[PDB]
Design a protein around this ligand. Structure first.
Ligand SMILES: [Mg+2]
Ligand SMILES: [Zn+2]
Ligand SMILES: [Zn+2]
Lengths: 917, 72, 241
DNA sequence: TCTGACGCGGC
DNA sequence: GCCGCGTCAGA
């Protein structure tokens, strides 16, 4: 097949471990001290693991092309590329066997479950604390019978031979060895055929599975106790020398250098026939070092080096956030990248971005090299490198022609949803900061107070076409979470529009007549008319109907000088009835949505272009600004406070003579201050949103043109609460818990506060400020979990054929519908048909709803239908293209290949950074 | 986005994924044919977009495109 | 947020309620030792009693006599998440979950289509407990893919050979995460020591078949343009053949 | 801190 | 067959 296509894991017999070994390690040596060459047969022996340079032995004799596959003879060195010092293991010979820590302390202990004994009973045997019958013998003892030293002595006294009870790893290994399976499987399966698994045989269930597995695989169960353990290629635990004439060992070198000389001393002891006490001590010290090497800290007080850190053992490299899996397998600091500070650049188009010519010169350098060479301005590579180092003039031209249509990527650090990454088309700029079209700073969730973006380049022909087709900003209009658009004008693009789209009663040129847009333009530039005047315009243009018709519309309409100025940008196809209103944000979004759903996708991006280009223009000819007299304190504030404080004195009276309790006094005081603050707040609304003027004839109230009122009646930036705290009064400040303080703050920000009043507020200030930082890790946690749960849900097949789903209905909450049926079930296909209460069918099974057909549900009075949920698909390990419905991001039936699971995962926890309580 | 976009191409081929693979095959073919005679790629666009234009103008009929792989 | 957390990880909250799928009488009369039982069997047509022990430190949710159905509320409090799956069926559980989650979301200005929530719910429902020993073992947990394939193996090969009887079980999201098949993805997620040392015994094979494995080894993931390739290139064979 | 899954010991 | 007390595993 030439490509492996399965991966399997298994236990390593001591005959496989030798088969891996290109040698054997014998003395705990790493590198000679005076000269830094490897040592004979230590932990860097070039005879075993490989050479150091390329095609060159250590003693340097065999150094010529004549002899390549040759094996030197002064040093045992081979001759081959040094690249084998990372794929060539070794091994170590163990005098006495030693238990693989994992299969003992993994909870549940597979050794324990096998031998059917409690762990501590095993560890006692292992720690040289008892004995255990290995030879049954005629003696009445039991095999797995722990015997203390003196009871063992008495067994020796009364029975002598005919039974052996050894202590140490050899004991466990012998037991596991002489443990027949077919003697045991059925014998236990019969006790399980005696099923009374209320408490007893709720235990015996696993041993079945374990003993069956060990039979099925073909693994000798005694292999869980090692007799020879391997070593790791040296270039995975290097000893490279670095500045300061010093070296940088790895923590593994030390644990290896320990296990080795402990094994050595053990062999020497066994040789010299020492007393059994120190034999025991060595045989135990060895087990300890082995366990430390595997993963120290599982059982003891894990060893530390001079710096007193717990060492980074073997297993501690492939777990944890800093480990090996989610650090360097899904990590990978990549190349062809850069990062800098973002700035605005309101001249671009929705598919462009600034790019400092320096970062451009850097990221594209090899492309520049190729084009110079082929261009015939340099012939070598050193040539081009030496001519780019000095920034020749032709370099800039060739760079600019390199990137004519070579998109890049842009990304902002906390990347919560797929709109966190989009593709643009660069264009050179001077300076040292990235510019990006403003209409997208909502997707990247960016603002220009210092955020920095990264930029990666695609290289292939498939990639840099996949970025073009699936990733360019002009494809991402609607949000995957919900069909609502994502590129709507945001902050003062909205101020200007709302401003020039209002009306005024007595203005200049009022009631005039104009034939077409150019007329109004010519007029308005002459400076006679007020832009808020009411005029009459005669229009004539096509309009698209719902059903694909396109009927003509004409006549005279009473409009405003401002709105007509927007008549130019509206493309042919949409009715003027959209622009002919006051144009707060909720309507600009309406315009864009309507445009997309009927006219196309490109029409929408061009429309948003012109909308920005105009809103920016007219939002500065109006010079909106903010003084301090624009914040108008209401007039009845002092007396409205006097009433409240008098009532408070009265409540304190009712208490002081013990006429009322405490808690009720507290609660009623709370309500007093709350209601009065509400009143004084509601007052300034009329005190700032209305302005009367003795217009010709009399004084009549009109909607004010105040600045701070317009900044918030247009949803641009603000809300009623901030206005309250500016002009009204702060009110109730909750001490850390949330229990309100029995003194409210009567002043406001235009008036300033006394020391105590500020202090009372800093409590909640700090609490709310600290509560975000202590969340920023939690939502990421939840979305991580969710991505795991459903990472492999892919739309794979058109239809699953089934006919079962769920029953949907408007989700009343006893006080309101709060979600209509005609909105809950939009764009989701129908399980079965639907019968009128008069009898005739209305909609058939398998009929994807649509805002045309979704009239026919509230029309005929229906309140329950059956739709195809993915809970009730019928395909295995996937999803059909119908039990899921509309893509809700491109307004079509889901194309086959959209990884729906990931989208749904990150469209749940993403807004979670905001939902707090 | 100079002249042609995905919204155009999506009318003939479908699912917007098949577009990627088909255009990639076509651009590879146009690339390996030595079109890089270097007096043209400095006056016009990269083949990666030439292929998209070719698919938009409905010249190639991707049913045909695959039949150029057997021509490999 | 932690409310949502509780919803997803399938937590049975503190002292929610009790149920009884053995319809019958509704009464008391057993020993009043915080072990109050009932007469939930017929006791007239079928002389039996099918009740369970329970304390007496609260109120009650039935009178001295009633026609108690199979799975009605027998004590007030929250609603367990593990009961509805086996008592009210599937769809009731689904409706409960959606009306909870979309409420806790919309109540803060957010907007989220349901079809995102349900395609998460779906992955919490990949495991059942087996009843009829067709060829697998007893009530141990098993995949619905495993059952749904081996059932169909027997379904026509031999005769149907009395394939399977099972019942869906509800497990949390982390619990349904680690309990997958591919040992590679599970080993990447968390608790690596345990999963590695467990799969080491069973000589576990792992067909790649997923998204977080072709990435560990650098292959076209089996989605997106990957399936587009596996389709278009496959369509070349039928021509050149 | 926790929250639990999972224990495995007193009775 | 269970009321409290542990370890492990992630925050
Ligand atoms: Mg910022
Ligand atoms: Zn030599
Ligand atoms: Zn389906």
């Amino acid at each position: 097949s030439k490509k492996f296509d399965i991966i399997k894991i298994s236990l390593a017999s001591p005959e496989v471990i030798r088969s891996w070994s290109h040698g054997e390690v014998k003395k705990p040596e790493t590198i000679n001290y005076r000269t830094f060459k490897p040592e004979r047969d230590g932990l860097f022996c070039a005879k075993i693991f490989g050479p150091i340079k390329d095609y060159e032995c250590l003693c340097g004799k065999y150094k010529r092309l004549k002899h390549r596959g040759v094996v030197c003879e002064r040093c045992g060195v081979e001759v081959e590329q040094a690249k084998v010092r990372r794929e060539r293991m070794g091994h170590i010979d163990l005098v006495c066997p030693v238990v693989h820590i994992w299969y003992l302390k993994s909870l549940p202990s597979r050794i324990g479950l096998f031998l059917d004994m409690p762990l501590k009973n095993v560890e006692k045997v292992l720690y040289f604390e008892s004995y255990i019958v290995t030879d049954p013998g005629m003696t009445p003892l039991e095999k797995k019978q722990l015997l203390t030293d003196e009871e063992y002595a008495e067994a020796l006294e009364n029975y002598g031979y005919e039974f052996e009870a050894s202590m140490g790893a050899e004991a466990i290994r012998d037991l596991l060895a002489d443990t027949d399976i077919e003697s045991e499987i059925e014998l236990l399966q019969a006790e399980c055929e005696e099923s009374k698994s209320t408490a007893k045989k709720e235990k015996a269930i696993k041993r079945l599975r374990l003993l069956e597995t060990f039979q099925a695989s073909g693994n000798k169960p005694e292999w869980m106790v090692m007799t020879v353990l391997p070593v790791l290629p040296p270039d995975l635990r290097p000893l490279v020398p670095i500045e300061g004439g010093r070296f940088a060992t790895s923590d593994l070198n030390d644990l290896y250098r320990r296990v080795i000389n402990r094994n050595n001393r053990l062999k020497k002891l066994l040789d010299l026939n020492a007393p059994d006490i120190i034999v025991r001590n060595e045989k135990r010290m060895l087990q300890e070092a082995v366990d430390a090497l595997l993963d120290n800290g599982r059982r003891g007080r894990a060893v530390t080096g001079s710096n007193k850190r717990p060492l980074k053992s073997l297993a501690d490299m492939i777990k944890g956030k800093q480990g090996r899996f989610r650090q360097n397998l899904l990590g990978k600091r990549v190349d062809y990248s850069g990062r800098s500070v973002i700035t605005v650049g309101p001249s671009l188009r929705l598919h462009e971005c600034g790019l400092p010519k320096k970062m451009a010169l850097e990221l594209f350098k090899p492309f520049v090299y190729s084009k110079l060479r082929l261009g015939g301005h340099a012939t070598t590579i050193k040539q081009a490198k030496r001519m780019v180092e000095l920034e020749e003039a032709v370099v800039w031209d060739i760079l600019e022609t390199v990137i004519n249509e070579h998109p890049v990527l842009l990304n902002r650090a906390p990347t919560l949803h797929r709109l966190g990454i989009q593709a643009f088309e660069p264009r050179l700029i001077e300076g040292k900061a990235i510019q990006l079209h403003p209409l997208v700073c909502a997707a990247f969730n960016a603002d220009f107070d210092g955020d920095q973006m990264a930029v990666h380049v695609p290289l292939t022909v498939e990639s840099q076409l996949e970025a073009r087709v699936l990733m360019m900003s002009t494809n991402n209009i609607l949000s995957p979470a919900s069909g609502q658009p994502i590129i709507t004008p945001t902050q003062d693009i909205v101020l200007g529009l709302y401003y020039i789209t209002r009306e005024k009663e007595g203005a200049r040129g009022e009631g005039k007549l104009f034939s077409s847009y150019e007329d109004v333009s010519r007029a308005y530039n002459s400076g006679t008319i007020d832009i808020h005047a009411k005029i009459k315009l005669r229009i004539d243009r096509q309009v698209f109907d719902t059903k694909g018709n396109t009927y003509n519309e004409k006549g005279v309409v009473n409009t405003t000088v401002g709105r007509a100025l927007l008549l130019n940008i509206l493309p042919e196809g949409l009715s003027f009835s959209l622009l002919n209103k006051v144009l707060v944000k909720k309507e600009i979004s309406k315009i864009i949505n309507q445009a997309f759903r009927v006219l196309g996708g490109k029409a929408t991006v061009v429309l948003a272009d012109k909308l920005m280009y105009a809103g920016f223009k007219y939002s500065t000819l109006s010079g909106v600004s903010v003084g301090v007299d624009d914040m108008t304190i209401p007039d009845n504030k002092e007396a409205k406070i006097e009433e409240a404080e008098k009532e408070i004195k009265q409540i304190t009276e009712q208490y002081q003579s013990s006429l009322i309790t405490e808690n009720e006094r507290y609660n009623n005081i709370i309500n007093i201050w709350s209601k009065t603050s509400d009143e004084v707040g509601a007052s300034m609304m009329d005190a700032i949103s209305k302005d009367t003027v003795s217009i010709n004839g009399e004084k009549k109230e009109i909607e004010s043109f105040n600045s701070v009122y317009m900044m918030a009646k247009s949803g641009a930036r603000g809300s009623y609460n901030q206005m309250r705290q500016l002009a009204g009064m702060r009110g109730l400040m909750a001490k850390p818990d949330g229990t309100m303080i029995e003194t409210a703050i009567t002043a406001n920000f235009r008036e300033g506060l006394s020391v105590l009043q500020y202090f009372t507020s800093t409590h909640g200030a700090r609490k709310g400020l600290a509560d975000t930082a202590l969340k920023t890790a939690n939502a990421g946690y939840l979305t991580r979990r969710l991505v795991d749960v459903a990472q492999d849900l892919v739309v794979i097949e058109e239809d699953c054929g089934t006919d079962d789903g769920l029953m949907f209905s408007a989700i009343v909450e006893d006080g309101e519908v709060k979600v209509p049926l005609v909105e809950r079930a939009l764009g989701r296909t129908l399980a079965a048909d639907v019968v009128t209460e008069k009898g005739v069918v209305l909609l058939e099974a398998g009929t994807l709803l649509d805002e045309n057909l979704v009239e026919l549900l509230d029309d005929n009075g229906i309140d329950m239908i059956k739709v195809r949920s993915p809970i009730t698909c019928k395909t295995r390990r996937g999803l059909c293209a119908k039990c899921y419905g509309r893509d809700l991001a491109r307004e079509r039936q889901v194309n086959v290949g959209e990884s729906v699971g990931v989208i749904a995962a990150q469209s749940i926890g993403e807004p979670g950074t905001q939902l707090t309580m | 986005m100079a002249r042609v976009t995905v919204e155009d191409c999506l009318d003939k081929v479908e699912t917007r994924f098949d577009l990627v693979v088909l255009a990639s095959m076509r651009a590879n073919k146009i690339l390996k044919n030595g079109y890089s005679e270097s007096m043209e790629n400095e006056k016009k666009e990269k083949a990666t977009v030439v292929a998209l234009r070719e698919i938009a103008e409905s010249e190639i009929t991707s049913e045909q495109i695959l039949r150029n792989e057997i021509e490999g | 947020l932690p409310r949502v957390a509780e919803l997803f990880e399938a937590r049975r909250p503190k002292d929610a309620a009790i149920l009884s799928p053995c319809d019958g009488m509704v009464r008391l009369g057993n020993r009043d030792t915080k072990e109050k039982q009932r007469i939930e069997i017929i006791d007239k047509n079928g002389h039996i009693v099918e009740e369970i022990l329970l304390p007496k430190s609260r109120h009650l949710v039935v009178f001295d006599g009633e026609q108690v159905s199979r799975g009605d509320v027998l004590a007030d409090g929250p609603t367990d998440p593990h009961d509805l799956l086996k008592y009210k069926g599937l769809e009731e559980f689904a409706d409960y979950i959606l009306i909870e989650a979309q409420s806790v979301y919309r109540m803060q200005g957010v907007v989220i289509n349901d079809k995102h929530i349900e395609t998460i719910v779906r992955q919490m429902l990949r495991k059942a407990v087996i009843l009829d020993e067709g060829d697998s073992k007893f009530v141990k947990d098993e995949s619905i893919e495993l059952v749904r394939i081996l059932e169909e193996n027997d379904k026509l090969r031999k005769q149907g050979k009395k394939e399977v009887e099972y019942e869906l079980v509800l497990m949390g999201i982390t619990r349904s995460s680690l309990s997958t098949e591919s040992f590679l993805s599970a080993a990447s997620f968390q608790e690596t020591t345990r999963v590695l040392t467990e799969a080491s015994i069973n000589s576990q094979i792992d067909n790649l078949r997923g998204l977080k494995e072709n990435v560990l080894i650098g292959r076209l993931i089996p989605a997106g343009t990957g399936l587009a390739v596996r389709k278009e290139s496959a369509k070349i064979e039928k021509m050149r053949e």
